Amino acid sequence: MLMPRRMKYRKQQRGRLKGATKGGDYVAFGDYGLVALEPAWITAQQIEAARVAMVRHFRRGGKIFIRIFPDKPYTKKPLEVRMGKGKGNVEGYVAVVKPGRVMFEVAGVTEEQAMEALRIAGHKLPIKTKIVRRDAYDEAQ
Amino acid sequence: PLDVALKRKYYEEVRPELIRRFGYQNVWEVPRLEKVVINQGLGEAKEDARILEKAAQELALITGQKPAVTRAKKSISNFKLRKGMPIGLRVTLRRDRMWIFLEKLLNVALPRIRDFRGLNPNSFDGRGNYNLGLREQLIFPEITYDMVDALRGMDIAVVTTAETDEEARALLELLGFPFRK
């Protein structure tokens, strides 16, 4: 999960999400990696879920890194209200992730390990992903 | 010109030892004296008027001058005095005047002090300067018990054209500053 604990605005307007990754598809960290496929928010709920399922499966495992960060406020309105009158609320604390972005990466593992790990992990995630090695990624800072 | 005991010795004694050991083949680069300012900034001027500066003016009185009540800067809510107009007793000494200051200093002011072990050899700025403090005001000659209230030490500040430790140090020792050890 994790997030800023008091950042700036309790509410910010959802947004239009097209594509470009903005940058962040290479490495310098993990040997194996998971890259997003569809332009979307990914919940810190799903985020710590992947975190779990992953470290979960490979116990005693090495370190896993997250380049990304869930810094977006969902504006949630109360259940069965009526329109207008206000706005949503600081719920659903998620990250903006567009295709190409490396959500997360592993190192110290095995081949098959990193495979199955990132496999189930990304399976959890609210979309689909790509499993990747570490080669052409060489250089981009 | 106001020839005191240490100024004349400065003229003579400095050029030998300094130029001979240290070596300075530049008539004017040779880093000698500079501004010697004295400062006694308390924080007790919460108020007590300039009846509290009155005891601060008696200080410049002893050096033979009149001072400047420079002050604070900020709003300390803890030990009072916001804004910044309390006590920061400050006066500047140059050439001849500075000379008689250090005269009274190491001729008679030094002797006294009860914990006068030896001048602090660690209080160097490293840029040809030398700051230090002290416990008693009356340590200086011209002030005896008749005025004192309790405690009023000072913060002697001194600058030199000097830039390193040894030059200013042995300068002080060719101008009578017996250090610790």
Binding site: - | V4, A5, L61, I62, G64, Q65, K66, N107, V108, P141
Partner: protein, 35 residues
Amino acid sequence: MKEGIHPKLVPARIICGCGNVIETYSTKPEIYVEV
């Protein structure tokens, strides 16, 4: 030191407890101390 209300100067001595006879030039005419 300029001005006009300056507490002046004038020479002073030092009749120490040893017999020292030092010649100074500060604020107070009759100075004499310890060593």
